[PDB]
From a paper:
The ubiquitin–proteasome pathway is a fundamental cellular process in eukaryotes that controls protein degradation. Ubiquitin molecules are assembled through the formation of an isopeptide bond between the carboxyl-terminal group of ubiquitin and the side-chain ∊-amino group of a lysine in another ubiquitin molecule (termed the distal and proximal moieties, respectively) or on the substrate. Lys48-linked polyubiquitin chains are recognized by the proteasome as a tag for the degradation of the attached substrates. Most ubiquitin-binding domains interact with the hydrophobic patch of ubiquitin and thus the conformation in which the patch is buried will be referred to as the closed conformation.
Author numbering:
A (entry chain A): 1 to 76
B (entry chain B): 1 to 75
Amino acid sequence: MQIFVKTLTGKTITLEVEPSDTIENVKAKIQDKEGIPPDQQRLIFAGKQLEDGRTLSDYNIQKESTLHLVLRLRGG
Amino acid sequence: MQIFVKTLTGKTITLEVEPSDTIENVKAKIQDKEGIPPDQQRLIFAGKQLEDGRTLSDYNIQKESTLHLVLRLRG
């Protein structure tokens, strides 16, 4: 399925994912696409920062959903 | 000064803050108003997660700015 991953600064990308993908797996796809290290990524859905070892299905993330990506880097 | 705190798929509130307030101080004000424990709050500006020991002025957060709030639950 496709999801959208959007920053709060208005940048949107699409990703191909499966319900059984972990949030960590999604971070790995974002790193492949955009170069951002997983430790610098925080993914958000339903107002909550998502736990890395849980899956998209665990969070009831549906096709065409938007996840938000927040960056985390010391001094930024 | 007044700032807004918006939770991503939830509510918007106002807060009264000072430029010298630390992010930890702002979390405390959100707890006073909303009951959310500070350790579970993550505040966001310019697309990134803010750090507890830095102040609003450190990020050039000014009057009528918006901070986004997301929740990081206990384990």
